[model samples]
Target: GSPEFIAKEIMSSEKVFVDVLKLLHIDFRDAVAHASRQLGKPVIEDRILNQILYYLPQLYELNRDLLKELEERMLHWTEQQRIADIFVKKGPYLKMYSTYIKEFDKNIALLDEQCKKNPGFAAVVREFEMSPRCANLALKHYLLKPVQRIPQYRLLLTDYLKNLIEDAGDYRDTQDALAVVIEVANHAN
Candidate 1:
């Protein structure tokens, strides 16, 4: 690791966490909720997208509180260094998120396969590709997110923990979250 590498590593320390938090709580969460309703119109087929529709409400429910918490707490941190401070207070809450992912991957792959074979399913997905929110990305990309999400979470949480020192107050909380989320990831497999 050179100077560029070391500083870039630290740059991602809280910076990456905050961005992940924002992406999860704000953008991804909101978009999933919207897509559920958007695609929910009329009857539909495909068990995978159906599974996604099944989970979206629950996922949105999970994020609604997190987004609210982030909304209020983010103001407390005047500096980026202070951003990590909230993890402990939110740790128990973080632990609860493990449940947010039950049966997710199963659906994602199922939908991916369905989309590849079924023109009807692909047509259904086009509804979202038509949304102003998708930014030209296709439905499968957005649908693929839930499958990628937990690994994304664990990878970053691990990164945060790797940079963290044992004496730090946030360590325990990060560790707790890491454990809970890891179980979720592991349990998924």
Candidate 2:
């Protein structure tokens, strides 16, 4: 883990990221069920969350896989070398879901409004945010996490690609994935 600075950044990023992954699991797996149960009936906010709940964890599983892959790849690595052999093994999810997300923007907006207007909805969301695993991070922030997932991958892949020769074996697929990731990130933006 030498080049202490690189080790620190990489490890710190993973620590924070793993925390996020856990919080997301708690949010999607536990909190959403509780929210639906507590609400006793469907509401716009619940629907928004449901729509997001539909895809977010799929994104999480992929991201967690990518992180693990990166960790293994870095076991004997360099900041600049021909070691960018990491492929975007699950690269197409972003392409698919990023388009799927456009359907939710209006709903996401409505959910935001309902969070203010409907006390029951707001209370459910507040309770959702108050889960023991993630009381400090707001539910709304968690809601946006799905959209952010692709950009995060794009960033991570770029860092990985930078350490490799441009024409390396993995470079073509990595570059192709980056272009797709960029498309996903851009549409979200």
Candidate 3:
């Protein structure tokens, strides 16, 4: 019912976004790392694991920077900061996601093929699936996080705008920002 209420919810949602990124890194990516160390040169030579893990490190770094930018903006909440403004400023960087999205299906296909053919790699996946951080979810579920991100942003921004005054400057910036986000979603979808 108040600005503080809306602001707190938005901040909380963004935190969840980062938390998922942490899972993507610590749980999903690290599983691949352990599998890499175990499987060694054969998979490396075939480029199977490499294909599956492509751009994940860079993707993690991208979102890490975003959390920094977002936290800085949120800290000055008294100054009437617009969270959408961060998305607008960082719009160009969002384009990097397209390459990953384009390659996503093939990467998953390769991973599944390897799991079926390579018992060693399959054992690593089994161990990771049993890990505390992973909570028994399949790797594909974590891999899908990046693909789902754009649409999730759209959902959050739409709800955020609903709590805002239609005529406010921040509202207008958010509307503009959503168009950019929608464009990214269009490409990713």
Candidate 4:
């Protein structure tokens, strides 16, 4: 049977339907406890409990879509803030790291030239020598920061995106710093 037909049959049933609750792995006692806490009540009737249980799956499915829509709206709403904060929070560290990487690259280029002139000497130091592509470290560092930030930002962005996408869903913005890092790293390679 289709999910919708089964849902309809469950909703239409008058008997105490525990199968749906069991199938969904929802403990009635725990749910009632949570509701009572929220509602500031110690006792709940069996009728209300059964009604809530019957509707729980539908409510959950509805809220799942709602949450996704809300997330997309939040992402759109806070795009400016996210972009600004990403730059403001990560900018200094990235700048410092990038500078170090550039200097490291220059030093490595000199070593590479020396290596070509004296292959035997190059072999001796090759294991310890740096590469001109040291910018990867900077890129890797920058990428790692976002791993920590994304979860925090995701909470904020999901709500914002829900609103923003409705109006201008196709809008695309670029992070220049990320692009520059990628380009520089690629050039070094």
Candidate 1, residues 62-140, lDDT tens digits: the string is 5455444544544443342222334445556554445445555655566677667866555645554575655667654
Q: Estimate each model's TM-score.
A: 0.55, 0.65, 0.80, 0.22
Better of 1 and 4 by lDDT: 1
lDDT (C-alpha, whole model) for all candidates: 0.51, 0.59, 0.73, 0.35
* Poorest stretch of ten by lDDT in candidate 1: 1-10
lDDT string for model 4 (6-99, tens) is: 2223223311222322322243335445555766764455453333233345433433343344344335643522232332334344343333
Clashing pairs in 2: none
Give candidate 2's error at residue 128 in angstroms.
3.5
- Model 1: lDDT of residue 33: 54
- Residue pairs with clashing backbones, model 3: none
Worst 10-residue lDDT window for candidate 3 reads 41-50
Write one digit per residue (lDDT tens) for candidate 2, span 19-66: 575675555445556665767765445456656455656656666765
Q: What is the lDDT for 164 in model 3?
A: 86
Winning model by TM-score? 3
| lDDT per residue (tens digit) for residues 121-148 in model 3 | 7777777877887788887887877778
- Name the lDDT value of residue 86 in candidate 2: 37
Candidate rank order under TM-score:
3, 2, 1, 4
Q: Which regions of candidate 1 fall more than 4 Å away from where they truly are?
A: 1-41, 45-50, 78-122
Better of 3 and 4 by TM-score: 3
